[model samples]
Target chain A: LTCDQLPKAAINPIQEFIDSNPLEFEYVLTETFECTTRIYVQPARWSTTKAPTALDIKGTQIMAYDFVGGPENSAHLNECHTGDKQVWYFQYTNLLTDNGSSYCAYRCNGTEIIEYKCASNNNGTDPLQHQAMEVAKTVPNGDKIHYAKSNCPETHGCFAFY
Target chain B: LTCDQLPKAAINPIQEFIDSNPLEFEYVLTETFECTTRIYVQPARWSTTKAPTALDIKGTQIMAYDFVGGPENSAHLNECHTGDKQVWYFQYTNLLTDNGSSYCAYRCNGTEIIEYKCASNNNGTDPLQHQAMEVAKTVPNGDKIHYAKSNCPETHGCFAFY
Candidate 1:
């Protein structure tokens, strides 16, 4: 089945993100019907000296709350070394839903992207949400997330599996 | 792109099993691509009084290794609640290619299934595979695993993700 068709509230954060972003790359499940939700946010600004805004389910920007992980300790959740693209990940399985969002965020030298966890309420400063801190370079001054159910449009982008 | 196309050496136990058993479900992959080698083995027989033969990738009939988990622990892998079917799972990742074959053996009754870990070779008594034991009443006797890219024809079956 599809994400909207399933218990949307099961993964409220991602579902909410897509409801607003509406345009992205995604793959929801496997053949015999396993669990999977892969979404990508393209090149947006993320950096060393400045952290971009945190995105809400509706593609809106909020302040950073809890930040974790860096290359120093291999602390990032899921990262893709597909190429020059700095694709990092932060999953939100703590919601304890059957739906697991496999998140992959693409860094911005100038691009789009996406982060994680379960918060009672996904506001800008909620500590329960699994967060992604500064990785390498930043893209734009703002932050944005993407949503799709197929192959990514460009060579690389951020993703959150639905 | 596909299982056989990638470096088969990544997961030797699964590769060797497929090389030998060549008669069941299949799929495998690496870090670059998305299409995975996810094959699902199907239902055969199980019971409390009788333990079924554990088949390798070659479909060889071997005895059970050590077992773990219970209905209390949700030990059975790749199970589906779609119909009157018994679905089991054998995950490629669970094998932990980075760690290699942590194989498990299972037996089922009416409701639950489980296996343990680290059986030597997933052979009769290799004792180097991860095993998850029984979780419910035993069903019958005999053993089997199936193969498919999209659908499951039998009732109770196993699977390896593509």
Candidate 2:
């Protein structure tokens, strides 16, 4: 969204060329980058919930996160996948904000739980990069969890008392 | 494919932890990630021709190129019009040494011409923060272009006329 609008780069469009705009200019604007919105938590593939992960033999922590927008319907992703069916990605730091809202899935044993929240668009928001959710599922490295409160039914997620 | 194959990460059953191995540091690394399939070009969206001034309108150029493990493929956008199919996001700066590659989006006219890429498990010549895909289309100020390229040759939205 930066095709040189707002005074058309001013050759004569900033109120009829405010005297050749930058006839004398020396600029310096650098902020490098410190934007955050990385909520990438893809965990939940307990093999089919035959129930894996007791500390993941040689590997128990695999990560991926990017979350920036919030309260998109009272978002909730307690570490994302612990119940099952996992996949999420966020990186909203501008364009106003709000691109989140955890998902649904509750199947106890036959294996088929869920955890979905997918929102991604590019070009801008200060810092951007996201989009990937085939049906949303990822959690394989030992799985054992229970986070309840689908979309805030009053909120209770963050469970783990075995 | 992790979690010690699947045994609740109980470890040790990995054939008795590699037969109580003596490979030192208790090794077990099958991690991966590496590729180099280069080529950078963007100029899609139905056209008979003349869509190249390098691609006018706020032109920019960069091909001083520096690559090592590319992570290439995608930018082969087709002619536009399913919704204008215009979502572009790509960043690969290796400049002179640490080298680069790993960018995706092979095609698009909206959902059908799909070929999105950017996935990370980490294992590399250099792999970190390497995930950016989705430009969401909607920016065709080039005028008279009601969809060409044989009526959407697989989604479009490309322009680098400069």
- TM per candidate comes to 0.24, 0.15
Tell me the tens digit of each residue's lDDT in model 2 across A1-162.
111111111011111111111011011011110111111111221112111111100011212111122232222222112322322222111222253121121111123322222111221211221211212122321122221112221211111000
TM-score of 1: 0.24
Proportion of true contacts reproduced by candidate 2: 0.00
The stretch of ten residues in a row with the least summed lDDT in candidate 1 chain B is B58-67
Residues B78-162, model 1: lDDT tens digits: 1111112232333222342333233332233433222212222122222232112121112222112211223423211112110
Per-residue error (Å), model 1, residue A142: 5.0
Candidate 1: true contacts recovered, fraction: 0.00
> Over the stretch A39-59, how does candidate 1's per-residue lDDT look in tens digits?
112111112222111222211
What are the per-residue Cα lDDT tens digits for candidate 2 across B1-162? 211111111111112211111111100111111121112211111112312101101111111111111223222222211112233223222111233222222223333322222321112233322222112121221121111112212211111111
| TM per candidate, chain B | 0.23, 0.22
Interface RMSD of 2: 25.0
